[PDB]
Coordinates of C-alpha atoms in Angstrom, one line a residue:
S1 CA 2.2 -2.3 -16.7
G2 CA 0.0 -4.1 -14.2
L3 CA -0.5 -1.3 -11.7
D4 CA -1.9 0.7 -14.5
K5 CA -4.2 -2.0 -15.8
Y6 CA -5.5 -3.2 -12.4
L7 CA -6.8 0.4 -11.9
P8 CA -8.6 2.9 -14.2
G9 CA -5.3 4.4 -15.1
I10 CA -4.5 6.7 -12.2
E11 CA -2.1 9.5 -13.1
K12 CA -1.7 11.4 -9.8
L13 CA -1.8 10.4 -6.2
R14 CA -2.9 12.2 -3.0
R15 CA 0.7 12.0 -1.7
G16 CA 0.5 14.3 1.3
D17 CA 0.4 18.1 1.4
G18 CA -1.4 17.8 -2.0
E19 CA -1.0 15.5 -4.9
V20 CA 1.9 13.9 -6.9
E21 CA 2.2 12.4 -10.4
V22 CA 2.4 8.6 -10.7
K23 CA 5.6 8.9 -12.7
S24 CA 7.4 9.3 -9.4
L25 CA 6.9 5.5 -9.0
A26 CA 8.5 4.4 -12.2
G27 CA 10.6 1.4 -11.4
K28 CA 10.3 0.9 -7.7
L29 CA 8.7 -1.4 -5.1
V30 CA 5.2 -0.1 -4.3
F31 CA 3.0 -1.5 -1.6
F32 CA -0.8 -1.2 -1.0
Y33 CA -2.4 -1.3 2.4
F34 CA -6.1 -1.9 2.5
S35 CA -8.1 -0.6 5.4
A36 CA -10.6 2.0 6.7
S37 CA -10.8 4.6 9.5
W38 CA -13.8 2.8 11.1
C39 CA -12.0 -0.5 11.0
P40 CA -12.0 -2.7 14.2
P41 CA -8.4 -2.1 15.1
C42 CA -7.5 1.2 13.5
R43 CA -4.9 1.5 16.3
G44 CA -1.4 0.2 15.7
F45 CA -1.0 -0.7 12.0
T46 CA -0.3 2.6 10.5
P47 CA 2.7 4.6 11.9
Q48 CA 4.8 1.5 11.5
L49 CA 4.9 1.7 7.8
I50 CA 6.5 5.1 8.0
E51 CA 9.0 4.0 10.6
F52 CA 10.1 1.0 8.6
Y53 CA 10.2 2.8 5.3
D54 CA 11.5 6.1 6.6
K55 CA 14.3 4.2 8.4
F56 CA 15.5 2.4 5.2
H57 CA 13.9 4.4 2.4
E58 CA 17.3 5.9 1.7
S59 CA 19.0 2.6 0.8
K60 CA 15.7 0.8 -0.2
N61 CA 14.3 3.8 -2.1
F62 CA 10.7 2.5 -1.8
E63 CA 7.2 4.0 -1.5
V64 CA 4.0 2.7 0.1
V65 CA 0.5 3.6 -1.2
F66 CA -2.7 3.6 0.9
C67 CA -5.8 2.0 -0.5
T68 CA -8.9 3.0 1.5
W69 CA -11.6 0.5 2.4
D70 CA -14.5 2.8 3.5
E71 CA -17.9 3.7 2.1
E72 CA -17.8 7.4 2.8
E73 CA -15.1 10.0 2.2
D74 CA -15.5 11.3 5.7
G75 CA -13.7 8.2 7.0
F76 CA -10.6 8.2 4.7
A77 CA -10.6 12.0 4.5
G78 CA -9.7 12.4 8.1
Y79 CA -7.7 9.3 7.7
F80 CA -5.3 10.7 5.0
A81 CA -5.1 14.0 7.0
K82 CA -1.9 12.5 8.6
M83 CA -0.4 9.7 6.6
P84 CA 2.2 11.2 4.2
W85 CA 2.5 8.2 1.9
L86 CA 0.8 8.3 -1.5
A87 CA -2.9 7.3 -1.5
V88 CA -5.3 6.9 -4.4
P89 CA -7.9 9.7 -4.6
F90 CA -11.6 8.9 -4.1
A91 CA -11.8 9.6 -7.8
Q92 CA -10.3 6.2 -8.5
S93 CA -11.6 4.4 -5.4
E94 CA -13.2 1.9 -7.8
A95 CA -9.7 0.5 -8.3
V96 CA -9.4 -0.2 -4.6
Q97 CA -12.5 -2.4 -4.9
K98 CA -11.2 -4.4 -7.9
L99 CA -7.6 -4.2 -6.8
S100 CA -8.5 -6.5 -3.9
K101 CA -9.6 -9.2 -6.4
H102 CA -6.1 -9.2 -7.8
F103 CA -4.5 -9.5 -4.3
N104 CA -7.1 -12.0 -3.1
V105 CA -7.6 -9.7 -0.1
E106 CA -9.6 -12.0 2.2
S107 CA -10.4 -9.2 4.6
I108 CA -9.0 -5.9 5.9
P109 CA -6.7 -4.7 7.2
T110 CA -4.0 -6.1 5.0
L111 CA -0.7 -5.2 3.2
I112 CA 0.4 -6.1 -0.3
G113 CA 3.6 -5.4 -2.2
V114 CA 3.9 -5.0 -6.0
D115 CA 6.5 -3.9 -8.5
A116 CA 5.6 -0.7 -10.5
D117 CA 8.0 -1.8 -13.3
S118 CA 7.2 -5.6 -13.3
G119 CA 3.5 -4.9 -12.8
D120 CA 2.5 -8.3 -11.5
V121 CA 2.3 -9.0 -7.7
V122 CA 5.6 -9.6 -6.0
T123 CA 4.5 -10.2 -2.4
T124 CA 1.0 -10.5 -0.8
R125 CA 1.9 -11.3 2.8
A126 CA 3.2 -7.7 3.4
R127 CA 1.1 -7.4 6.5
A128 CA 3.1 -9.9 8.6
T129 CA 6.4 -9.4 6.9
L130 CA 6.6 -5.6 7.3
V131 CA 6.2 -6.1 11.0
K132 CA 8.0 -9.5 11.3
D133 CA 10.8 -8.7 8.8
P134 CA 13.3 -6.4 10.5
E135 CA 16.1 -7.5 8.1
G136 CA 14.6 -6.5 4.8
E137 CA 16.9 -9.2 3.4
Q138 CA 14.0 -10.4 1.2
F139 CA 11.8 -7.3 1.0
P140 CA 10.2 -8.5 -2.2
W141 CA 9.0 -11.3 0.1
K142 CA 8.1 -13.5 -2.9
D143 CA 6.3 -16.8 -2.5
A144 CA 6.9 -18.9 0.7
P145 CA 9.4 -21.7 0.1
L146 CA 9.2 -22.7 3.7
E147 CA 7.0 -25.7 3.0

């Protein structure tokens, strides 16, 4: 619904070894990490996603998508060479630019969580939670009712 509107209508993803249809994410909790290979840190926030997801993906059955934040393909290209998660191809990189406006991305790097089925955003503070939430008891980490 929303994930399809926010973007130009992506049908396939860069998955890993090659590409994978979007249908594979029909009714699940998808996340979107915005960043670039030339980013200031670019050392730490990356292999954690896989560990957190790969460790509970069985019971959680979720998927994380990577949204580049570079100007040239040379950066994200060598960047996706490893990460297995599904990443939007440069073809629809335009979405990544507009998608931010929907997530109010102040600045990279960051992490956002959305529902493929629901469409609308379910959680935007996925950057701190994914790292600071080792219980996954509220994975959809909705709004913050802690005052």
